[PDB]
Amino acid sequence: RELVTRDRLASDLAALGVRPGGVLLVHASLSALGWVCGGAQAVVLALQDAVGKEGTLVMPTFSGDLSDPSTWRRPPVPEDWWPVIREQMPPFDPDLTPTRGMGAVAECFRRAAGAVRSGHPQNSFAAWGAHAEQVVAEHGLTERLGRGSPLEQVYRLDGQVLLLGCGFESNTSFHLAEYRTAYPGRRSHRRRVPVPEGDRVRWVEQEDIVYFEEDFQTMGESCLTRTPGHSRGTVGEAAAVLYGQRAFVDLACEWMTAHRDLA
Amino acid sequence: PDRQDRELVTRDRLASDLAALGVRPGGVLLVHASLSALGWVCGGAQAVVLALQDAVGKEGTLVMPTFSGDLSDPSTWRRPPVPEDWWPVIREQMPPFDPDLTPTRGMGAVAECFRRAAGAVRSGHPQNSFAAWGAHAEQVVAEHGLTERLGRGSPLEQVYRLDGQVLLLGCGFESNTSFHLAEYRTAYPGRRSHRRRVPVPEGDRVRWVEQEDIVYFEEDFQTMGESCLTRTPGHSRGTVGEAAAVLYGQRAFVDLACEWMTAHRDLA
Ligand SMILES: CC(=O)SCCNC(=O)CCNC(=O)[C@H](O)C(C)(C)COP(=O)(O)OP(=O)(O)OC[C@H]1O[C@@H](n2cnc3c(N)ncnc32)[C@H](O)[C@@H]1OP(=O)(O)O
Ligand SMILES: CC(=O)SCCNC(=O)CCNC(=O)[C@H](O)C(C)(C)COP(=O)(O)OP(=O)(O)OC[C@H]1O[C@@H](n2cnc3c(N)ncnc32)[C@H](O)[C@@H]1OP(=O)(O)O
């Protein structure tokens, strides 16, 4: 591993094209960077250096565990436990609820001085900087990753997306394209969301779009090459991709309508 | 019980088990927790924080070590040691301790969750901070000085002053920080001092301050622990979920610890 510092990461982010004063949605891997002097704290500081005082950093802070136990599959739980879990699950707390599968950087980021987290109990985002409150305000149940969500806010704020040591499999912005596009064979289903109600949760059944993630690599690579101003490069030891979210999401809508046809 | 023989443990079950162990409502409580020891916690670390907040109540105070031992000189790193060439770079480029940003190391999921709770506050020592929540939180974390990082003018001293209790939740006397308060207070036979480098925050950089400190001796923790505990009036042993738990009065125990070291420690 290469010894990588706060200053080196910040300079490499500027070399990739991270706009001072811009809104930046970050999908980060800590272990891909090399050996980070100061670890996840050094990564967060370098990202704040890159965007500057007038910039904004946004990161997914998903808490997938706050979901019906019948859906659980990494460690599935006994069926006899399901009703106790449903009644006793603590409600989402933006300060207390940890992230799952988001990475050490977002988990370190969410608590930063000035960082604010959105209200969705499963798909919240944390933001820091000039437009942080706007990014996280009124995150609705209707389209958790679409209209009235922080993904829509990054779009309206003409932000960039940084894939830092991870690829299109972590590209949340494709979900914004999925909600906006009536592509052939688009499906819906009913989901259970635990909505906070004091010290308890109130399970609310809601309809939602069924996401499709199999073509993320083919769609990403095709949309990325057609996104004007995009860049590829190395930040530390990590392979990185930087792109304008607006142009890219609009191309993803065009890709889904032309190339998706579900069984 | 699941495939892995773990039993379902809930926030309400943990708070009641804590009340049954003897956790006092309105009291100051210093916690040393293991999440895996508890069983399968419904809501994980967040459910342990909430159950501990329920046990002490609104008038109570929770305190936990939030140590960030990586903020030390690279020459001392052993678990993951780094090339000697990197040491001057590491010394120059290490970010300063930030109470909001710096993660804990070796503290566990519960402390890591706790430190960010609404109303929790964290002390200023770059290696040995504590986080506190509740009625006397600000008092507990306020005076964190360099002279005795785990002694006079440290959150361990505030727990003592406020007549707090100590909870060892699924871990034992190897995690008992209160022993360090006794170590500073007692001139036991072979007590040593050494010099240590502490990175002090200086804006965006660290300033490496060499300071004198007491050398901690930890090999007798279990022997001293069992001896002081059995003589601590009103202590309790019990079960919190699946975890073996110990609850004791910090003032009486720390005082017994000082007497134990004077009588049984003789360092060469
Ligand atoms: C359907 C959808 O698309 S939405 C989901 C959106 N997802 C995201 O935004 C997540 C974006 N991030 C990713 O995708 C990533 O690839 C991840 C987090 C899932 C995987 O990345 P990893 O690098 O494997 O994990 P992470 O970033 O948590 O790093 C911790 C690892 O770094 C290492 N590490 C620890 N300290 C340091 C340091 N100073 N320097 C370098 N590495 C370190 C350790 O190897 C650690 O592993 P351990 O904690 O098991 O010992
Ligand atoms: C010199 C001195 O005396 S001062 C030092 C004082 N130290 C302290 O106060 C720390 C107090 N804690 C301890 O001593 C503990 O024994 C520790 C933290 C060192 C080890 O405890 P562990 O239970 O092994 O770890 P921790 O509490 O972080 O729990 C995480 C483990 O819980 C498990 N886990 C995760 N979710 C759940 C859940 N819902 N339910 C139950 N277990 C879970 C996983 O195994 C996890 O480990 P992973 O992150 O590898 O997946």
Compute the distance between CA of residue B63 and CA of residue B156 in angstroms, rounded to an integer.
Answer: 9
Residue B29: strand, helix, or coil: strand
Q: Cα separations (Å) of B165 from A93, B20, B21, B26, B95?
A: 28, 15, 12, 11, 35
Rounded to whole angstroms, how far apart are CA atoms A20 and A8? 16
Tokens of B202: 């200086």
At a CB cut-off of 8 Å and minimum separation 6, what does A148 contact? Answer: A138, A139, A140, A142
Query: Is B236 annotated for ligand binding?
Result: no
Contact (Cβ atoms closer than 8 angstroms) between residue B257 and residue B231? no
Q: From atom 42 of ligand 1, which residue's Cα is the shortest distance away?
A: A31
d(CA A154, CA A249) in angstroms, rounded, equals: 11
**Cβ atoms of residues A209 and A185 within 8 Å:** no
* Bridge partners, residue B31, by sequence: B167
Chain centroid to Cα A211, Å, comes to: 15
Question: Is B100:A111 a contact under the CB 8 Å cutoff?
Answer: yes
Please tell me whether B33 is known to bind a ligand.
yes
A129-to-A57, B12, B91, B103 alpha-carbon distances in Å? 6, 38, 29, 21
Nearest CA to ligand 2 atom 7: B175
Q: Say if B82 is an interface residue toward chain A (CB within 8 Å).
A: yes
Size of interface A-B (CB pairs under 8 A): 89
Q: Is A195 on the interface with B (CB under 8 A)?
A: no
Return residues 99-118 of B near A (CB < 8 Å): 100-103, 112-113, 115-118
Name the residue facing B46 among A7, A85, A97 (closest C-beta): A97
- Phi and psi at A253, nearest 5°, equal -65, -45
Residue B261: count of CB within 10 angstroms of its CB: 23
Buried b (16+ CB within 10 A) or exposed e, A12-26: bbeebbbbeebbbbb
Q: Calculate helix-pair angle for A39-51, A6-16, nearest 10 degrees.
A: 40
Atom of ligand 2 nearest to the CA of B35: 27
- Measured between beta carbons, the chain B residues lying within 8 angstroms of A97 are 46
Handedness of CA A72, A73, A78, A79 (dihedral sign): positive
Q: What is the full DSSP assignment across chain A?
A: --EE-HHHHHHHHHHHT--TT-EEEEEE-STTS-EETTHHHHHHHHHHHHH-TT-EEEEE---TTSS-GGG--SS---GGGHHHHHHHPPPP-TTTPPPSSS-HHHHHHTTSTT-EE-S-TTT-EEEEETTHHHHHTT--STTTTSTTSHHHHHHHTT-EEEEES--GGG-TTHHHHHHH---TT--EEEEEEEEEETTEEEEEEEEEEPP--TTHHHHHHHHHHHSTT-EEEEETTEEEEEEEHHHHHHHHHHHHHHH----
Q: Whose CA is nearest to atom 21 of ligand 2?
A: B34
Cβ pair A245, A216 in contact under 8 A: no
Exposed / middle / buried, residue B80 (Cβ in 10 Å: 0-12, 13-18, 19+): exposed
The Cβ of residue B79 has, within 10 Å, a number of other Cβ atoms equal to 8
The residues pairing with A241 across neighbouring beta strands, listed in sequence order, are A163, A232
- Count, in order, helices (H) and strands (E) of chain B: 9, 11
Residue A200, CA distances (Å) to B17, B47, B57, B122, B169 in order: 20, 12, 18, 28, 25
Pick among A36, A88, A117 to test the B interface (most B CBs inside 10 A): A88
Could you identify the atom of ligand 1 that is nearest to the CA of residue A169? 3
Residue labelled with tokens 């949605």? A25
Give Rg (Cα) of chain A: 19
- Inter-chain contact A65–B45, Cβ cutoff 8 Å? no
Quote the CA–CA distance of A185 and B154 in Å, as a whole number.
Answer: 63
Q: Does A93 touch chain B (CB under 8 A)?
A: yes
* Most B-contacting residue of A37, A49, A63, A68 (CB-CB within 10 A), to test interface: A37
d(CA A29, CA A40): 9
Partners of residue B195 on adjacent β-strands = B212
Our measurement of the distance from residue A226's CA atom to the centroid of its chain's CA atoms, rounded to an integer in Å, reads 22
- Say how far apart CA A141 and CA A124 lie, in whole Å: 11
- B151 three-class SS: coil
Tell how far the Cα of B70 is from the centroid of ligand 1, in angstroms: 19
**Ligand showing the shortest atom-to-Cα distance for residue A3:** 1
| Closest alpha carbon within chain A to B119 | A95
| Radius of gyration over every alpha carbon of chain B, rounded to an integer in angstroms | 19
Largest pairwise CA distance in chain A? 54
Residues A34, A3: contact at Cβ < 8 Å?
A: yes
Phi and psi at residue A239, to the nearest 5° = -75, 135
Q: Specify the amino acid at residue A65.
A: D
Element (H, E) at B28: strand B28-33
Q: How far is the first Cα of chain B from the last one, in angstroms, to the nearest whole number? A: 50
**3-class DSSP state of B247:** strand
**Long-range contact pairs involving B84-89 (C-beta distance under 8 Å, separation at least 24):** B86/A3, B86/A37, B89/A3, B89/A5, B89/A37
Amino acid at B254: V
Two tokens, residue A8: 């080196």
CA distance B86 to chain A (A): 7
* Strands A56-60 and A23-28, sheet pairing: parallel
Structure-block tokens of residue B104:
């804990």
The CA B267 to ligand 2 mean position distance, Å, reads 32
SS3 B74: helix
Evaluate whether A164 touches A46 at the Cβ level (below 8 Å).
no
The owner of tokens 């009124």 is: A138
Which residue carries 């909870």 as its tokens?
B167
| B2 burial via Cβ count (<10 Å: 0-12, 13-18, 19+) | middle
Separation of alpha carbons B110 and B240, rounded Å: 14
Residue type, B113: C
Cα A163–Cα A102–Cα A95 angle in degrees, nearest 5:
125
CA–CA gap between residue B12 and residue A88 (Å, rounded) = 8
Work out whether the CA dihedral A24, A27, A32, A38 comes out positive or negative.
positive
Nearest residue to B253 via CA among B156, B131, B108: B156
Task: Give φ, ψ of B253 to 5 degrees.
Answer: -65, -50
Binary contact (A39, B70; C-beta < 8 A): yes
Q: How far apart are CA A10 and CA A12, in angstroms?
A: 6
* DSSP for residue B263: H
Distant-in-sequence, close-in-space partners of A94: CB < 8 Å, separation ≥ 6: A116, A117, A118, A119, A124
Q: What are the boundaries of each domain within chain B?
A: 1-268
Residue B31 Cα, ligand 2 centroid: separation in angstroms?
A: 12
Query: A27, A44, A8, A66: which is closest to A195 by C-alpha?
Result: A66
A68 to chain B, any CB pair closer than 8 A? The answer is no
Q: Smallest Cβ distance to B94: which of A37, A81, A111? A: A37
Any binding-site annotation on B109? yes
- In the structure, which protein residues have their CB atom closer than 6 angstroms to any atom of ligand 2? B 32-38, 40-41, 44, 65, 106-110, 171, 175-177, 218
Give resolution, Å, one decimal: 2.0
One-letter amino acid of B82: V
Q: How much of chain B is in helix, strand and coil states, percent to nearest 5? A: 35, 20, 45
Q: Which two tokens stand for residue B126?
A: 């770059």
Asked if residue B79 lies in contact with residue B46, where contact means CB atoms within 8 angstroms, the answer is no
Nearest to A144 by CA among A72, A85, A62: A62
Whether the CB-CB separation of A3 and A37 falls below 8 Å is answered with yes
Q: Cβ of B116 and A95 within 8 Å?
A: yes
Residue A85: its chain B contacts at CB < 8 A? 8, 42
